[PDB]
Design an enzyme around this catalytic site. Structure first.
Site, short mmCIF file in Angstrom:
data_model
loop_
_atom_site.label_atom_id
_atom_site.label_comp_id
_atom_site.label_asym_id
_atom_site.label_seq_id
_atom_site.Cartn_x
_atom_site.Cartn_y
_atom_site.Cartn_z
N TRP A 1 -17.44 16.76 -7.02
CA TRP A 1 -18.09 16.90 -8.32
C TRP A 1 -18.38 15.57 -9.03
O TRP A 1 -19.06 15.59 -10.06
CB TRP A 1 -17.25 17.81 -9.26
CG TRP A 1 -15.79 17.45 -9.37
CD1 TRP A 1 -14.74 18.11 -8.80
CD2 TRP A 1 -15.23 16.36 -10.12
NE1 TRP A 1 -13.56 17.49 -9.13
CE2 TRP A 1 -13.83 16.41 -9.93
CE3 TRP A 1 -15.76 15.35 -10.92
CZ2 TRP A 1 -12.96 15.48 -10.51
CZ3 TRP A 1 -14.90 14.42 -11.49
CH2 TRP A 1 -13.51 14.49 -11.28
N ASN A 2 -17.92 14.42 -8.53
CA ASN A 2 -18.05 13.21 -9.34
C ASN A 2 -19.44 12.60 -9.25
O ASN A 2 -19.88 11.95 -10.20
CB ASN A 2 -16.98 12.18 -8.95
CG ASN A 2 -17.18 11.63 -7.54
OD1 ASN A 2 -17.57 12.34 -6.61
ND2 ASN A 2 -16.89 10.36 -7.37
N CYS B 1 -14.38 7.33 -5.74
CA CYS B 1 -13.42 7.28 -4.64
C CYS B 1 -13.05 5.86 -4.24
O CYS B 1 -12.14 5.68 -3.42
CB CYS B 1 -14.00 8.02 -3.43
SG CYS B 1 -15.38 7.09 -2.69
N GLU C 1 -3.20 9.54 -6.01
CA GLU C 1 -4.53 9.30 -6.56
C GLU C 1 -4.66 9.94 -7.94
O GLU C 1 -4.31 11.11 -8.13
CB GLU C 1 -5.60 9.85 -5.63
CG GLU C 1 -7.03 9.53 -6.06
CD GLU C 1 -8.10 10.27 -5.24
OE1 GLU C 1 -7.83 11.40 -4.77
OE2 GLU C 1 -9.17 9.67 -5.02
N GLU D 1 -14.85 12.50 4.14
CA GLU D 1 -14.72 11.32 3.27
C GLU D 1 -13.84 11.74 2.10
O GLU D 1 -14.31 12.40 1.18
CB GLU D 1 -16.09 10.86 2.78
CG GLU D 1 -17.13 10.45 3.83
CD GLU D 1 -16.59 9.88 5.15
OE1 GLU D 1 -15.78 8.92 5.13
OE2 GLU D 1 -17.05 10.36 6.21
N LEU D 2 -12.58 11.31 2.11
CA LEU D 2 -11.54 11.94 1.31
C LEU D 2 -11.02 10.98 0.24
O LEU D 2 -11.79 10.17 -0.30
CB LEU D 2 -10.48 12.48 2.26
CG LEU D 2 -11.15 13.27 3.42
CD1 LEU D 2 -10.18 13.66 4.49
CD2 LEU D 2 -11.91 14.53 2.90
N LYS E 1 -23.02 23.32 0.74
CA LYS E 1 -22.17 24.02 -0.21
C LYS E 1 -21.70 23.03 -1.27
O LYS E 1 -20.76 22.26 -1.03
CB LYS E 1 -20.96 24.68 0.46
CG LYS E 1 -20.27 25.67 -0.52
CD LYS E 1 -18.76 25.54 -0.56
CE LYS E 1 -18.28 24.43 -1.47
NZ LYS E 1 -17.94 24.91 -2.83
N1 LIG Z 1 -14.33 9.19 0.30
C1 LIG Z 1 -15.50 9.53 -0.40
O1 LIG Z 1 -16.57 9.07 -0.03
C2 LIG Z 1 -15.46 10.35 -1.54
C3 LIG Z 1 -16.55 10.23 -2.55
C4 LIG Z 1 -16.39 11.08 -3.76
C5 LIG Z 1 -15.14 11.87 -4.03
N2 LIG Z 1 -14.09 11.81 -3.07
C6 LIG Z 1 -12.87 12.50 -3.49
O2 LIG Z 1 -13.09 13.80 -3.90
C7 LIG Z 1 -12.00 14.10 -4.75
C8 LIG Z 1 -12.50 14.76 -5.98
O3 LIG Z 1 -13.54 15.72 -5.79
P1 LIG Z 1 -13.24 17.24 -5.68
O4 LIG Z 1 -12.23 17.59 -6.73
O5 LIG Z 1 -14.53 18.02 -5.84
O6 LIG Z 1 -12.61 17.53 -4.25
P2 LIG Z 1 -12.17 18.96 -3.81
O7 LIG Z 1 -11.35 19.63 -4.91
O8 LIG Z 1 -11.44 18.79 -2.53
O9 LIG Z 1 -13.47 19.78 -3.51
C9 LIG Z 1 -14.32 19.37 -2.46
C10 LIG Z 1 -15.26 20.33 -1.90
O10 LIG Z 1 -14.68 21.00 -0.76
C11 LIG Z 1 -14.42 22.33 -1.07
N3 LIG Z 1 -13.01 22.73 -0.88
C12 LIG Z 1 -11.80 22.82 -1.40
N4 LIG Z 1 -11.12 23.35 -0.36
C13 LIG Z 1 -11.93 23.54 0.71
C14 LIG Z 1 -11.68 24.06 1.99
N5 LIG Z 1 -10.32 24.49 2.32
N6 LIG Z 1 -12.70 24.13 2.87
C15 LIG Z 1 -13.95 23.72 2.53
N7 LIG Z 1 -14.20 23.23 1.30
C16 LIG Z 1 -13.22 23.12 0.38
C17 LIG Z 1 -14.73 22.45 -2.56
O11 LIG Z 1 -15.15 23.67 -2.98
P3 LIG Z 1 -14.84 24.19 -4.42
O12 LIG Z 1 -14.41 23.06 -5.29
O13 LIG Z 1 -16.11 24.68 -5.00
O14 LIG Z 1 -13.82 25.35 -4.45
C18 LIG Z 1 -15.62 21.36 -2.85
O15 LIG Z 1 -16.98 21.72 -2.71
C19 LIG Z 1 -11.31 12.84 -5.08
O16 LIG Z 1 -10.08 12.79 -4.33
C20 LIG Z 1 -12.18 11.84 -4.61
O17 LIG Z 1 -11.48 10.73 -4.15
C21 LIG Z 1 -14.24 11.14 -1.83
#
Ligand SMILES: NC(=O)c1ccc[n+]([C@@H]2O[C@H](COP(=O)([O-])OP(=O)(O)OC[C@H]3O[C@@H](n4cnc5c(N)ncnc54)[C@H](OP(=O)(O)O)[C@@H]3O)[C@@H](O)[C@H]2O)c1
Ligand SMILES: NC(=O)c1ccc[n+]([C@@H]2O[C@H](COP(=O)([O-])OP(=O)(O)OC[C@H]3O[C@@H](n4cnc5c(N)ncnc54)[C@H](OP(=O)(O)O)[C@@H]3O)[C@@H](O)[C@H]2O)c1
Lengths: 477, 477
Positions: free
Chosen positions: B147-148, B280, B381, B246-247, B171
């Site tokens: 979402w960021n 991230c 984090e 990418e986590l 998605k």
């Molecule tokens: N390394 C990078 O390049 C990068 C860049 C930007 C952000 N990030 C990281 O992203 C994190 C924050 O974003 P976020 O809160 O949106 O992450 P998130 O809570 O993990 O959500 C990520 C996406 O994956 C889905 N999700 C959750 N569980 C899943 C599963 N078991 N299977 C498939 N999809 C699943 C989500 O769906 P729903 O949310 O709709 O339920 C969402 O679309 C931070 O830790 C940040 O560091 C990483």
């Protein structure tokens, strides 16, 4: 005879006092005992491998390649001892065993040519007075896990690239046939491989192996084996996100089109199923024969099958040795009985060998099943033995759909003189390794790469070697 | 109320379910989206598979020209999409304008690889034989975003997937999907054939989990938290789809004794408080050499106190709101835990108070001092405007501190010492290193995370090539 484990340049026992026997498939002679470590031995060997890698990486790539070239030549010097050991522990024909030793050496020698192909990239930045640098670096510690059908070559296949690229390696060989692999411990020391760069630990795949693959210290897993074990490793790698190079099961179709050269096709199909007693991951596992050549093809092919001499794998007249153990022989008997239950005909063979020359060992007859339909289990479950179902078909689109009707997608073989059938394979045949007018058998310069559940990410060649390196990106102002 | 874009049409979740989308600025409901579960995965995957067969047949120059037009339409509507991003996600307007632009340049950059997909002609060891290694599309790509920066993350994945001849099922994050869903309209306007780009909304743990493990999913490209990526890795055992994940991150920002303090202070300021800490690669732990600590902190705290928190449409605002109530509570919990563990709240540490912030989710820029390396805030984090500050005495110490981490994405170091910078290549376990500047990567780079920061990397040459599969032919003549 009892072997130890090779850890940090020393020979040590499993920290549990456990051993495991190694039994010859030829005569059921207990050949030796090996250490049977469990999960509690993972951290020691990984820590030792971690320490040794920091120094190994500092050595100029040319020296690493010189050490491994000596290692590979020491293996070639001991070809006869190592081949006879492979025949005794694994059951393959002596001539195949000599070929496996040579492949161990050449797998290492091929990787050495990549010693000088690890250049990074200078990337132009959008910002002035700034440079972007993308370096290639070692991953660190590689865990290498091998299967029993070609245990020694599968080790060299992974040792070579890992050590050339500056990694250290922890080899956990199959517990069925680890003896020749363990002997590399002594040759590693003779060649001057520094202590801890090459480690060889034996123990349960689901205990020690499972602990190694998910461990903090493990940066990469290169593993060969069945699909269920590869799936377990994928799950485990969620714990460390180690890069995983997994080469798993096959169910390769062998397709004889209507315009095939029947004599060339039958000889290719024969070797592709019955090489190494069916114990090849690219084997002809299901043979599709066009209905217009079926009768003529099968007369040629069945004359070849019925002439296969099963016997002692040190005997130069033997065309096929035993199966590797009782578990794998039981699998043959169960596949056959189940195929009869679902309606198939046993055209030839289909039982374990009888007679005085075979009261010891695990001996199965070359087996051909006919009146097989596409939905039978023998068309879908990997056999990894000398069992070949034969399915008729009437068109290209039909056999293509049969070929893709599978959870596996490694090898495929097709015999045809129609160039447009062959050209459609690029987009329509869902196999990663396709042989045209010949049998199975890959080369070091190729890319051994399985679709679907046959693996995630290939092995060998440049695209196999590149997986043993990591990248590091620098934005430098 | 929005629908889902599937096979060129707009449809509802097959369950009756919807989900509100709430602005972080004022808690206003902006729109309802479809809240589809696992039962909608197969249908969208089926039409993506069908559409890919015709998409891949189009010449790559035509696909690039369609995508270039898609990228320009996104730019044409920059103002609408940026303001939508401001309302749904809370970022500053000027950052939102940048994110739209980066969405278009992500796609345009990928169009440059449209003629960089040549295969290999490989010399065989056998006479009258050819080895061909072709590069082909993987098939169906599943793209999951965070979402960021929801719109740029979509484009970061749509671009390479579609240029390479795949189809894509996007998605988006359920927190901020609105601007991403607008792409469906623009995809029709640009002429992207029905089913090549699909957008479905629903819970990651239901719909997303079913998408990534499905037999029709040939590749997952996903951005998000480390636990979610660990769930995707486990699910990928069911299909062995290639996973580009990418986590999370925990980037150290390191101020050596010889740093340009004013330069370091400004790069550190933006690296932590850009996008309210929701990046991230953000500076998440600041290590300051004890010899410059007081002078550097006086410079740095001056800049922190000048951060103006407020309405992201107001150009005077330097920082907007946190994205939702749960993320805001996480800020309060992390600060309280840090104090309970022994840290000092040097500045900030509270929800913003007073009329003007009674609606929305507002947290102060926060600096924590007297922090030890083992405090939770140095390891977990935060993804928000919270910055712990740790002293150190030597380069060797701060390398150990930097590497003492489950994350390994970004790292920032300020120094004049070329020896320190050279040692980073082997000693700093981060994939993306910034020297004498702040975070912020580029399309030609490689966004690559070690340890639990992800699997393979994204962007650039090595990100694009993961959207391709290989096929090896052994052709006998
Ligand atoms: N390394 C990078 O390049 C990068 C860049 C930007 C952000 N990030 C990281 O992203 C994190 C924050 O974003 P976020 O809160 O949106 O992450 P998130 O809570 O993990 O959500 C990520 C996406 O994956 C889905 N999700 C959750 N569980 C899943 C599963 N078991 N299977 C498939 N999809 C699943 C989500 O769906 P729903 O949310 O709709 O339920 C969402 O679309 C931070 O830790 C940040 O560091 C990483
Ligand atoms: N695709 C290829 O390139 C390729 C080439 C040759 C063979 N294969 C396939 O490999 C199979 C050969 O027989 P196999 O019985 O040796 O395979 P396997 O039973 O899966 O054994 C493979 C190796 O992995 C280990 N194992 C089992 N579970 C493990 C786990 N959870 N973690 C780590 N290691 C684990 C094994 O240890 P233990 O022995 O102690 O159980 C063994 O060393 C066939 O399916 C064949 O098709 C693939």
């Amino acid at each position: 005879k009892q072997y130890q484990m090779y850890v940090g340049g020393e020979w040590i026992d499993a920290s549990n006092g456990q051993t495991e026997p190694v039994v010859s498939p030829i005569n059921e002679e207990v050949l030796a005992y090996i250490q049977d470590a469990d999960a509690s031995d993972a951290e020691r060997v990984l820590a030792v491998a971690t320490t040794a890698q920091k120094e190994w990486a500092k050595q100029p790539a040319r020296q690493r390649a010189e050490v491994l070239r000596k290692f590979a030549q020491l293996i070639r010097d001991n070809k006869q001892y190592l081949a006879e050991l492979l025949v005794k522990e694994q059951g393959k024909l002596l001539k195949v065993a000599l070929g496996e030793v040579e492949a161990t050496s050449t797998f290492i020698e091929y990787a050495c040519d990549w010693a000088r192909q690890m250049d990074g990239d200078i990337v132009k930045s959008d910002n002035a007075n700034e440079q972007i640098m993308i370096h290639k670096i070692p991953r660190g510690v590689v865990v290498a896990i091998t299967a029993w059908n070609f245990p020694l070559a599968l080790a060299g296949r992974k040792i070579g690239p890992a050590l050339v690229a500056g990694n250290s390696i922890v080899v956990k060989p199959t517990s069925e046939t680890p003896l020749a692999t363990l002997e590399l411990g002594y040759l590693a020391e003779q060649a001057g491989i520094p202590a801890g760069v090459l480690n060889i630990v034996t123990g349960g795949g689901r205990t020690l192996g499972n602990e190694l693959v998910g461990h903090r210290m493990t940066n990469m897993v290169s593993m060969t084996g069945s699909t269920p074990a590869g799936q377990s490793i994928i799950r485990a790698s969620a714990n460390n996100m180690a890069h995983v190079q997994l080469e798993l099961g096959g169910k390769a179709p062998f397709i004889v089109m209507e315009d095939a050269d029947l004599e060339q096709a039958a000889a290719a199909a024969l070797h592709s199923r019955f090489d190494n007693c069916g114990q090849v991951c690219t084997c002809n596992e299901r043979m599709y024969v066009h209905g217009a050549v079926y009768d003529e093809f099968m007369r040629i092919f069945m004359g070849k099958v019925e002439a296969i001499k099963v016997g002692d794998p040190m005997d130069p007249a033997s065309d096929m040795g035993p199966k590797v153990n009782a578990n794998e022989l039981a699998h043959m008997e169960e596949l056959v009985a189940e195929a009869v239950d679902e309606g198939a005909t046993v055209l030839f063979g289909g039982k374990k060998l009888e007679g005085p020359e075979f009261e010891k060992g695990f001996w199965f007859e070359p087996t051909v099943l006919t009146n097989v339909t596409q939905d039978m289990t023998i068309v879908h479950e990997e056999s990894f033995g000398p069992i070949l179902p034969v399915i008729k078909f009437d068109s290209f689109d039909e056999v293509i759909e049969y070929a893709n009707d599978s959870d596996y997608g490694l090898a495929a073989m097709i015999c045809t003189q129609n160039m447009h059938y062959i050209n459609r394979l690029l987009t329509e045949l869902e196999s990663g390794e396709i042989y045209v007018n010949r049998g199975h058998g890959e080369q070091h310069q190729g890319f051994h790469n399985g679709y679907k559940l046959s693996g995630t990410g290939g092995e060998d060649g440049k695209y196999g070697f590149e997986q043993y390196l990591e990248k590091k990106t620098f934005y430098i102002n």
